[model samples]
Target chain A: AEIYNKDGNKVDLYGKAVGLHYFSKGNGENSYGGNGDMTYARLGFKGETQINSDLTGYGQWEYNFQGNNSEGADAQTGNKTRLAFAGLKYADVGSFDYGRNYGVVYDALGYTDMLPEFGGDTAYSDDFFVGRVGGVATYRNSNFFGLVDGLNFAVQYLGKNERDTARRSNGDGVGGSISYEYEGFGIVGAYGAADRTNLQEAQPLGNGKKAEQWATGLKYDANNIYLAANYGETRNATPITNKFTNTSGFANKTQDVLLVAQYQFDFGLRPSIAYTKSKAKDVEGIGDVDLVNYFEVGATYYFNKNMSTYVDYIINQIDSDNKLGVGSDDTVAVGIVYQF
Target chain B: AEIYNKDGNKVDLYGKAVGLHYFSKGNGENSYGGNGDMTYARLGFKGETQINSDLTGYGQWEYNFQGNNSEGADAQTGNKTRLAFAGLKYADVGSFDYGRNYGVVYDALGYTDMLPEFGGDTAYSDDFFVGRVGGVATYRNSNFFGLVDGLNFAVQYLGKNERDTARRSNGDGVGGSISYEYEGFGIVGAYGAADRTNLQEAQPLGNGKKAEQWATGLKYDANNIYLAANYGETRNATPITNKFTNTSGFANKTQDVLLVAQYQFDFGLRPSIAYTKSKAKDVEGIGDVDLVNYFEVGATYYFNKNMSTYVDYIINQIDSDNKLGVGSDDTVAVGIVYQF
Candidate 1:
């Protein structure tokens, strides 16, 4: 809805809208919900301005129209924000932006996130993903000292909300990642950690927590075949847990291992699969916790470059006889993703 | 990211994101809410495809980024749909579109409902507008008979959500309006009604409800001044009121009257003011309701055609009291609406 008038700058909109339908009979309960939701629909806008050619001014507004059975019946603020920020960039000095973003740690884990549905994603398996954290400032550059190409480095800082008097400094801390690439092969490594410095109004100083993640990713692509394998470990105990009990188990402060891969065919079809194993020492320590062995497979048949229908199936198996009485959950979902 | 691209049709985007700051003090409570919160933040998509020389296929997906304080704290689907449907149309046979829209009742009253904020719109002021009801199909013609220009007619039908049970067929009944315009002067009249048939799962036949409205409007424009006056009444005391209790003299089987006028200047500024009065007769053996008088004033200053900021002040006064004590609420709101 914007164009270059008297100015040379350009403005554009970007987004994808997908409609979904899924049927799941899990943990002995049958349920069906979808169709009325927009799923993780991402819609946004951005502008690029010419600031004397040496630097540029940029800003973006991206939001997710997200909803799920997990989100109660009526969700206020259901149309939540994904990104809103403005920044300036220097041609050779790299670029910096501040707002909500997928931090460096997640960037390193990105290799394993290609599945349309679920794949053994250690970054997301049983715990809520730290998709995009707010109050963040990040700097990324592709060339180090102009000495090489295909080498990239990124670092980010997360500032606490000014009004959040509790547990100050690095309530969101620092994170960064580095990547290097050569024809058909690329590798990435990342680390992120945060610690509270003061006693929070609702949190004790002893609980001035430390959250961290260390990850690595290796990816190769030549021709039409793409392979990606990643390993990651994350330990952040937060009371922030989503309820998936009706489906399977969701826990915090857990350990996990994931492996995923996929290949694309010239005939507009792509199929992928992933396997993930997760364990929790047991929620808050009553002991002996069961484990979740997750398996997922997905296939997409593209109608065109911008539209396609896909199907995904996941088997959530529960390790038997543990403290938590969790069972098996399997979900089969099919939908059309239309990008315009 | 769209263009004609060797095709006869064009792809595009439609939406608006406005940040609002409102200061409301009334009923002994004061609060500021807006921004990061959607208020009529409309986002939508529409496309037109040529079916032949005189026919076309059209579809739209529109939703109001809506949420209410009454929507508890965090609502997911709380951000629901406004319009979703598809249809076919002809150039001269007139356009027959199927979807959700301002119910015919609102179409008839659209004249006076033009204020940026409020001015005694019964369909909105005291209740959640039965606005944009789904399961709707509408047919509109601009050149009625071709005998006279500027004459138009629109009629509509609605179907139930099926599971909406009881009320079948036009349980949504019929709604339509007629208007005639010549030059800068025009007039419109409309009527709408719906009823419970078998027996609503929740609404009994004895409660046999019927929601209906009849409205008329008149307006003249030219000479930089615009004048409009409308009279309308809505009756559907089905307890579907969208709450404003703190400052409402709301009642069932009510009567309402509204008036508004505005003028636009050559300097990209427009100011308008309006007043509306409403009353409810004792119903269901529930007697005595205070009279409600609503007054609102608004102004818009456009920063070119793509951007504008405005402010609105509304006073909700209760003329008397009852078991549900009533008081007064005054709201002052300011915001920037940037459309792209």
Candidate 2:
């Protein structure tokens, strides 16, 4: 990524990369294999510059680089696989940016989760309230309201062109979020809603109607201790169709709850734990499975600024009636990282 | 993305997201349609503290939010689709970082062509000398001979278990790159090699042998004009049915060449062109038809730091004798981009 000054001159550049090794195996022949998985190598860059004392500009780009034989099939190649956009920020009025980005649902969830993979956590299991990809314009107002020093409120508009399918002739959607921080306490809430005029256009076997999601969450921190909780609900006008579409339509009314906590000791040791549950009502083809739960715990020990060791344990469970054949699974992993 | 100060306190958090609407029609039906593409969306944080007059410590976490069905299957996604790393720098000595990142081959390629798609113009078209992914520990020495203002050299090691592959052995690979920039002249050269002796044990069709690549490039800039040329060669040892007992006895080689140029006018307009060619030699089943060529030309007009209008035309050709039909097709695309 590269940032330019007001005079169109380059000012700064930043970049980063990461690699991970993962393995999983089942206990019997019908079990999954625990082979190492190296498909998560990534590289990225970001840049920003001050246009004036009260104004700033920024942009970023990231991509996965794991070597794979597939052409465009590898989930870790191509540009903009991460984040890329340019925006201007005002000192006090806040800022407005137009591009593609996360939705309000993610913001309301805060940073509380126990999943091995950040976004893979149950907090975002329902596709309706996760991230949004499309033309989006957002506004953030800078204000603390005395409760916190850097309190802010944000609103976003998602254009019709941002939806996954073209058949859905629905108007643009709107979303917003509010966050406040005071001392070690922080709180956040967010919500988004979009009307689905023609569900059949977005997915096969669906009646045209409406779809929307609302979510809220908060977090608290004291010294080396952290705690968080969140809740979200979604509704769709159409009815569910398949296993993947379990969270869609009339059957799409889904609710989620999550709690997380973490603490760091003076000896450079930090441990964290989290739990999440999601439940849906009146979904078709989804069987009797209406709930999914996740639990995770992890610890990290820092040797210095450039080195650290980590270990994590995770568990995932889906109701037996889901008919997905996916029941309960658990995993434990440990690794060490060193930077210079 | 998040960046922490030397005192382990959060100092900065930033993110960007972009989306594009694309439509195209060709000889094939369903070739043209309304769709969304997440051009670039990323979050990054970085911070540095002065340890001494010429020494500092820095850390960064950059993540790509391409997963969660943000942009359909057109983008890389899934687990570990982000980058996290940290490092330190001594102005007079050098800078070192350890993490997953691009390999030597990518450093030699430098900036991409003016194509509008994800991988630029010449990606995956039998271009053996392309990007790489894996764990890396790298060192960048300060200035070279002092006359070459921005001259620097780096060496990196890629761990065998970088990817989540089952055939990983307890071994690693080494690579390096040398780059220099002065006035309107810039140059870079890089080389990398890896060995995977246990590949066959995991996959029957997998080749477990040694692979290496070497590349060099040069760029010139003068009076708002830029030109660049690059060359690279890659060799891979593969297993032969009954020819050699050791897979390393012989190897297949692929060579690539690229030339690009750009000119910027005072009226905020810039036009660029690029051409790339690659050829492979002595491959078993693939026969020697692995030759391909690509060409692209485009122009961009900046409205400001966050807005721009751009368009491009691209063409690709794959040798028919290569026995690869779909992979040898050609495409033409035109598009515009608005940063923020």
Candidate 3:
């Protein structure tokens, strides 16, 4: 809700609280196999001020608090910063911002990330430019400068953030995305590339001194029906784990694909189904592996505009025969969410 | 600003940004003595919903972001959760809250903690209910339930927080405060006590298995003039440092005193002067020590209710002859702040 709107300035508050639990009968290899609560709360503020007749300035800050941990040091460590950015916009021109925010590459992946519980497993934070990370400057323009009806584009530059000898250190990278929509159909494509840090280049899983990604997506939304498909590939970027061997490592290259369909009924119930697969190719010693191959079915019952409950079931389909030992078990999750 | 006020529900957003720098002639023993920006930002949300004609529910969450560090892991480490609490209030009765919040012991120290940049050195967080901490339940009443004017009281219980053997761990504690005001003059007193953990009891500085504190304060505010004084003592609860020997430890007993005076001018200027002293007595082997003894002079010029700038000078008077090395040099700080 717009809390303050006065003198050409406005501020809004947005957030949600979700209480969730997962149930699984698989071996305890995965933390999600337990029945512990996975509840959390998100809070954020968005504000914009009119700088002049054709210019405006805006900023946003968001946070996530884990509600499942004791109110102690563990809870403190669980706090996460989701977004923090400030920018200025000029009419029909564009907007520029810098700080911790979503990577431009996510513009394509976001189309198929609408699952109620499990989706978008290909992207990871601190991996090149596929998810939300820090130290980025972005410029975005919408509607082709007021010419095209539904054409938008964005460009981002990520600064070097050397954390360790791993893909977590994103050395100077650039990314961009462009999208077009007509009627109820939309399509988008994005790509990014970065130079790896000297330290990362020496690690076993780092593979190379250059990392890159490219993604494309298409979606349709009309008459309460939603459908989307996304495909992406990453080189020396995304990380994966050996499920059977319990070893953590990064992939030399990875291909990810997702498909989602959903229908919203008049009675405030939305049922969704999605399939996602992440295949790692040319791994260090394991030729090829299926990191993620799962199908999810879920339904959300909205009691009102601000509250909802959902049940999601995941069907994991990866076998234990993969060289990288990429295998997993199925699980179910139930959640209730409230937002304003 | 009131962001939402609908259906007997109200929410407000508040925060501040401060840009600060300090200059000192002291040795490199202090981190604040270096020439670097000490900028930070605070953001929070407060909301209430009327449950009935005489009952209301409320909650608050606040965060601190250190702006001086790069947008990296170090920056994430600097994030702090200053406040997080929820409560219920009944008109003409009282209010009760649970979560992280200020200790009732601060009711007395707050009177003399109004310096421009530096003040309130006696209270510390996670030290047995002296400052802001977690796992606390509090009850507060005001105006003697509509019988006596300017009468207020509060009670608080803090849960045990064990973090190894040190003063950082607090065994179940209880604290309370009472205050009365008449004709622009007020008097308040607060006290707290807690059991020491077994691990802390085995430490050299712990000295005792029980910790206790009592404080009293008085203040006068009227006609643009403000004056306040506070005095407190603690037994086996407060931490101290040895400046000469560079050993980190705690005090067996300590006394703290503070005096503050300020005058506000019609032209939006406030000049202030304050003095504070903290003496640690009966150390295990170091005998007596002075943790802090300083005089401060500062003035703030307000551009409006939302913005201000100030400069403060500190006069440190502690000598290095003390057993516990608590000696420090003088420093000056300049700051600009904006709030909404």
TM-score of each: 0.56, 0.51, 0.60
> lDDT per residue, candidate 1, B57-110, as tens digits?
554555566533345555333355555544445666777654444566666567
**For candidate 1, what TM-score does chain B get against the true chain B?**
0.80
- The digit string of per-residue lDDT tens for model 1 on A88-183 reads 778777889887666677777787777766553454311122356667888988676456788889888877643443322236578888998898
**Interface RMSD in Å per candidate, to 1 decimal?**
7.7, 8.1, 5.7
lDDT of 3 at B240: 68
How well is each residue in A173-241 modelled by candidate 3, as lDDT tens digits?
899999999999999999999888776776655377788988999999999999999999999888765
Candidate 1 chain A weakest ten by summed lDDT = A30-39
- The stretch of ten residues in a row with the least summed lDDT in candidate 3 chain A is A26-35
| Best-fitting candidate, scored by lDDT | 3
Q: Taking the tens digit of each residue's C-alpha lDDT, what string does model 2 give over B1-340?
A: 3333334333355665545334333432222121334254566555554545765555555555552264455334532333444455777678765544455566677644333342232222212223434345567786853334688788877655422332222235688888888888878898877765353334332343666778788888788988888887766522222112222222266677888778888887888787777666665445453445667666777667766666654455544333423143354444444432
Decoy 1 TM-score against native: 0.56
lDDT of each: 0.58, 0.54, 0.79
Cα deviation of B118 in candidate 2 (Å)?
29
Model 3, B1-340: lDDT tens digits are 7777999999988866554556665332552234334555679889999999999999999989754443334546667798999999989899999998988888888898898988888878877767887889999998988788999999999888888647577789899999999988999999999888877776666478788988999999999999999999999988865555555546889999999999999887999999999888898777777887889899997654554678887788876554665546777777655455
Off by over 4 Å in 1: A5-8, A26-41, A52-54, A66-75, A118-130, A161-172, A197-209, A237-253, A287-292, A319-328, B1-9, B13-81, B84-340
